[PDB]
């Protein structure tokens, strides 16, 4: 009913060896998602992959990525408090409203590439870019979730962990080849872009084997409602030879990307990922009004503690 300073409400998912429950912070009144995991039911490999996901989450703080707030660990349990996405998955949006206009699709795609480019700047590949992993906030703003298959990478070297959902997997992962990290995400962005503008998969079938033959063929239909600039973009990301796919920077400079009205917010956000490198006094005053010491709020913020002090500040800021 109440885990720490959070009051448990509806269950937003029950999967693998964990249960994600939507809960409210008792003091800040913020809407959060607490992934509850029993460390006494997981095999050693799965527990360590969960600990590695938390570290990767602590590195990825972006407006279009689900923000980790608090990590509460006991001797047998682990609770993972993260930002709650009100608008649900982008998959459930496409099922309910169909394909988006290239104006809506372009706006949401820019937010996805903004987070993917930021991942690859810190040398982190998501490796599971699905439309079910693209969550939406109250105003339908993209929020990349599920850094489950994500891992570090060295630019120029090849990865070998064959993971990723089949309808979005690149043909290298189907064949079981040592692939390049970012090109495997660029193929996933090719599938995601097509799903946003058509409301259907580029590659589909009755079974996984039918779908597998489809992805390996590289042939997909370009519809009448799809513009020439959009067709060129998708076609140059869904390429069988990875060495012939557009880079994350080429995707940003694509003619389709500059087709809307001038977007200075997008250019500023991708410029902050090539540069990488402010305490809200109104929040610190409210925390001191309650009783949360300023010295412990600052210590927990700089040491990446993700504790009661660190979480109350961040939740109060957002």
């Amino acid at each position, epitope marked *: 009913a109440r885990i720490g300073y959070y009051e448990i409400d509806r269950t937003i998912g029950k999967g693998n060896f964990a249960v994600v429950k939507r809960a409210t912070h008792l003091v800040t009144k913020a809407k959060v998602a607490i992934k509850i995991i029993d460390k006494t039911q997981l095999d050693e490999e799965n527990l360590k992959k969960i600990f590695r996901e938390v570290q990767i989450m602590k590195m990825l703080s972006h407006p279009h990525i689900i923000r980790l707030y608090q990590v509460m660990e006991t001797e047998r349990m682990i609770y993972l408090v993260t930002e709650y996405a009100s608008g649900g998955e982008i998959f459930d949006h496409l099922v309910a409203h169909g394909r988006m206009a290239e104006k809506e699709a372009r706006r949401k795609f820019k937010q996805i590439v903004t987070a993917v480019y930021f991942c690859h700047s810190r040398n982190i590949v998501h490796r599971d870019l699905k439309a079910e992993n693209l969550l939406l906030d109250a105003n339908l703003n993209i929020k990349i979730a599920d850094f489950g298959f994500s891992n570090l990478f060295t630019p120029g070297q090849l990865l070998k962990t064959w993971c990723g959902s089949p309808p979005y997997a690149a043909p290298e992962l189907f064949e079981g080849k040592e692939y390049d990290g970012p090109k495997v995400d660029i193929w996933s962005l090719g599938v995601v872009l097509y799903v946003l503008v*058509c409301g*259907a998969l580029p590659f589909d079938g009755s079974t996984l084997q039918n779908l597998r033959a489809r992805v390996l063929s590289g042939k997909f239909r370009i519809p009448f409602f799809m513009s020439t600039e959009c067709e060129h973009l998708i076609r140059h990301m869904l390429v069988l030879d990875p060495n012939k796919r557009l880079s994350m920077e080429q995707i940003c400079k694509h003619k389709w990307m500059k087709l809307g009205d001038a977007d200075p917010n997008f250019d500023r956000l991708i410029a902050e990922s090539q540069q990488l490198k402010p305490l809200n006094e109104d929040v610190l005053l409210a925390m001191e009004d309650m009783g949360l010491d300023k010295e412990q709020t600052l210590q927990s913020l700089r040491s990446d503690a993700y504790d009661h002090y660190s979480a109350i500040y961040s939740l109060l800021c957002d």
Partner: single-chain antibody
Amino acid sequence: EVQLVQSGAGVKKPGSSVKVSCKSSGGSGSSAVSWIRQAPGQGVEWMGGITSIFGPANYAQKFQDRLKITADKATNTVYMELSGLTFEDTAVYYCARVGDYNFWNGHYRSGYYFDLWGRGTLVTVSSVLTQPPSASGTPGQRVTISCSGSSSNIGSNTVNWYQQLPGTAPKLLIYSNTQRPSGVPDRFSGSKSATSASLAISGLQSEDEADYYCAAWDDSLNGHVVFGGGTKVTVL
């Protein structure tokens, strides 16, 4: 008691769009409803619908450009929108539910049989499987309807048979090649041999005067359910 309620008959002008709804009553969630249309005097053709767990929706190549299939899971409603209408889109639009949804993981190949059917919506716009066009027999005889496909559809998938009584929506008669749904008498038998399928109606009765269609999923491209041209069975 589970039935598929459809929206009313519409008269549309050229270039306009039409939206047809399909509300499920009696149970409750997870359906896999598809949209199939039937031109006046012509056979039935699959337009699009839920065909796998992977994507939000699947469309036949012919309808992808003008069809938008949506679903309000909060009200058990499934919608269909066809834009850029012409007199050739004047047809009886049906919504039909796939019968084996309850078994859909990633490896199970669906039979793609239409368990339930809607009454049909009359849409009027202001201006693949080889089957014999007709079959006849005297009461008591046995008639056999041939249905030929290719290795991409019948060769690699199950065959279904539908009976469409004059003026009604089609009804599932045979599923999974040989299976007779509850109510279908043992007089009707289905069979399949490599890329061919057959329907035998033994002890032919006056009540058997209907159009019969064979249907099998085709693995070409994103996949589609292909229907036969239909066989009108008359009794003498």
